From TrEMBL, chain A:
The keyword Zinc does not apply. Gene3D superfamilies: Hotdog Thioesterase. Pfam families: MaoC_dehydratas (PF01575). Keywords: Oxidoreductase, Plasmid. This is MaoC-like (Monoamine oxidase-like) protein, similar to NodN. The keyword Oxidoreductase applies. Residues 23-119 form the MaoC-like domain. Its EC number is 1.4.3.4. GO terms for molecular function: monoamine oxidase activity. PANTHER family: BETA-METHYLMALYL-COA DEHYDRATASE, MONOAMINE OXIDASE-RELATED. It is an enzyme of class 1 (oxidoreductase).
TrEMBL record, chain B:
Coiled coil: none annotated. Keywords: Oxidoreductase, Plasmid. It comes from Rhizobium meliloti (strain 1021) (Ensifer meliloti). SUPFAM superfamilies: Thioesterase/thiol ester dehydrase-isomerase (SSF54637). InterPro entries: HotDog_dom_sf, MaoC-like_dom, MCH/BMMD. The lineage of its organism: Bacteria, Pseudomonadati, Pseudomonadota, Alphaproteobacteria, Hyphomicrobiales. GO terms for molecular function: monoamine oxidase activity. It comes from the Bacteria. Its EC number is 1.4.3.4. This is MaoC-like (Monoamine oxidase-like) protein, similar to NodN. Residues 13-109 form the MaoC-like domain.
Automatic annotation (TrEMBL), chain C:
The lineage of its organism: Bacteria, Pseudomonadati, Pseudomonadota, Alphaproteobacteria, Hyphomicrobiales. Gene3D superfamilies: Hotdog Thioesterase. Pfam families: MaoC_dehydratas. Residues 13-109 form the MaoC-like domain. It comes from the Bacteria. It is an enzyme of class 1 (oxidoreductase). It comes from Rhizobium meliloti (strain 1021) (Ensifer meliloti). Signal peptide: none annotated. The keyword Oxidoreductase applies. GO terms for molecular function: monoamine oxidase activity. This is MaoC-like (Monoamine oxidase-like) protein, similar to NodN. Its EC number is 1.4.3.4.
Amino acid sequence: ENLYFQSMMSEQTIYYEDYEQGHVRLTSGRTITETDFVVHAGHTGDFFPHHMDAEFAKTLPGGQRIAHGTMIFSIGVGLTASLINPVAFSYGYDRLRFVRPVHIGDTIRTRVTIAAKEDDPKRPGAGRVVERCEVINQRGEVVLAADHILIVERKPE
Amino acid sequence: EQTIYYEDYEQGHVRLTSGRTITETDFVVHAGHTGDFFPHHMDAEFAKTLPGGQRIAHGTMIFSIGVGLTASLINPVAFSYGYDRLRFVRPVHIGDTIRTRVTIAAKEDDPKRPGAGRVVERCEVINQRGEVVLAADHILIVERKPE
Amino acid sequence: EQTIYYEDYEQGHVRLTSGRTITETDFVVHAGHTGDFFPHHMDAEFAKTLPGGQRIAHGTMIFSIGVGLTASLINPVAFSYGYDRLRFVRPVHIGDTIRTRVTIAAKEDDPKRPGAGRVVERCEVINQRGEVVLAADHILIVERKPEGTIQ
Amino acid sequence: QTIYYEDYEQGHVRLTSGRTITETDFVVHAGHTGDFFPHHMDAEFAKTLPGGQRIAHGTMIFSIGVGLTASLINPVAFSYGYDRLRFVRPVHIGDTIRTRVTIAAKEDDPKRPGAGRVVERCEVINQRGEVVLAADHILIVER
Amino acid sequence: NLYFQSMMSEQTIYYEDYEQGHVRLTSGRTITETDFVVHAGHTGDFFPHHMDAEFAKTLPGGQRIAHGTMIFSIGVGLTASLINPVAFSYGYDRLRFVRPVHIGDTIRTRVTIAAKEDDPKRPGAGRVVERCEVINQRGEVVLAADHILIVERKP
Amino acid sequence: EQTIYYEDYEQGHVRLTSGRTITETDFVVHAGHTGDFFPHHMDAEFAKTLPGGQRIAHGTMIFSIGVGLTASLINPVAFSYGYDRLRFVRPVHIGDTIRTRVTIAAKEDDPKRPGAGRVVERCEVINQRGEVVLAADHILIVERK
């Protein structure tokens, strides 16, 4: 283990064998603000009026501006970035789904569940772990879901 | 706004966006926006330990900006259902420049909706070496032309 | 990148951008970006004592966002020379929504630049009531299509 | 600019103009610092707090509070530190703050005879005139 | 009061006190890559001349150039002052983009009270033109504009 | 989230945060957030004339970021009363990387709160050379178990 992580409270090294199927964690919450809409637009270059024009949004089903899909994804994932596992590599995501729209003033939390574990066909010293991520709003409704695929080092001899 | 119905999507149609250089500011803004300050992205000293020896962009940043580059016109009769097979193919470093290729990759009927079809838009983000750094299949549910 | 040569600009052509609501965020970002935190812009209590009773939008913010709304139309053969008659016309309140109307107001030969022409694009920033809040004449130096050799 | 040590006058008070603390400022402060604690960032959680709404980060009230005094920054004063920084009252979205700076003390230093200690008492006040933050700024000033 | 000073939130300056020929030069501010990225984010303008370093190699100076609205906004911002209750800011004339600004250039703004004129429709006010010139670290003018004020005459 | 009561704090316990490189972006964002654009921080040409020859970070930025690095796990049972002895020890420059060392420095009975105690957490912001650049004593009022 790199000396960096010595004395780091937020570091939890979990090797492939020690991931527990069914383990669940839930993040703290974050209210999605009009600032977040404007920051996301400026960061990504997406200024579509569905996100940025309160007058146009009155004509939409639902009558209000809706958050960019990539914002709910980025923030939902970002909420999980508290504990670092230095032995896990982020390979990608499967089945990213936009389940419900998110509006200004909604508050989100992310639930992360260890879903599946398999051998890595390419690397014998690693395994694959799927973390199911569910972003939930203040009504307890899923607004986004995705399966995060991690390539996790096996524990050393 | 340009209404494009299911039947008008052309399998194999491709567009490539303009380029955007990914800067250290983008790393710092992404961390600030998302809450992800992991040292692989934010600590230049720690990042010397990575195979590239330098900080790597968040996967969600390359996704968000990659997709953002394609946000040039809206189709009011296409619903963004989700993405399949999002892959972080190669790291992106400060100073790399990305462009996004969007391809109409597949079209299928929708089992539940006879009034709509599914269109898969393949999104491939490429760097200044012409290498794919991120790929994902965008799933759209697109209404059929009336009558 | 869509190229339009001088001769293809159509006198009197009008285009209108998509809209964008001017938010309190935009005020705070503009103040932070430009260094202008004076209380007529940034102090809601003091602003109660001003004509109108509300924080006053930075003129440069309405200009920068107003022009920014037009950015999708990229003309690589046009050089931005400057602007004439930048006018601050009406208040813009937090929550107002703006669009920019761009009209080809004038085309003229430029004697200093034989391979180019001058195009004036009148830009009018309009609010949700259709009122002009800011106007400016954008001066473009636009390349002519290559001089042909006429046989 | 400049104010030499002898030019400071104990008891002098300066009151800044105001700045309204916005939701933007909360979100920017979290992004800038990495502090996303739910007291600041989660309006549902914040309903459980005594005020029932989100409260500004102490470091934001400090940074913006001190920033209001910037047009008055003396280039001949080394900023040594602060004593007795206190988070007196919460600041909510939409509150407006001003900073009151009082020259609280001047003392000769046993380490530099060619300089003196100046203490500037800083009080951030809200639109109700209530102190929300206080701190003693220690300056080492050229004699 | 020597012992209690309240910073103003406004400051009245009548026509006669804009003294023609008066010059002021602001402090400097280095224009950074952050400023380019923030400006694009703020305005929605991501044009490759400003945002694509590879594309910019093909341009005459070989590098990204600042948005005109950025140099204007920051240049004016450097000069920002207290609201003047007796002056109306009409807008600007003859805004010119004189030279490109690159990442790492440092700018200051020079404001000269350039011309004063009577107003035929307003005997109790007069027109004041403030010539604003944004200069870079070499002292070259990169942007110029004439700020137009209508200012009440002293009672 | 982790609840730690007064008795649970261990005199002398030490932790170090993750690190963060202080970038030019952080300087620009700090100025934009605080309204302080003074040339020592924001003018690279002027800064050549200063003793170090380069722009120096705002004290309030090193404090805000240095403390922010510690904000990874809420203790709901602790109240943030203030800080003593905030000291600006060394300048921080663009490209310096900081992390924060947090030490439980002192524990004592709260004079007026029977059901709480007082904990001092010394925060030392440390650069890439391991040098302390900023120190502050975070004063916590912590509920008894």
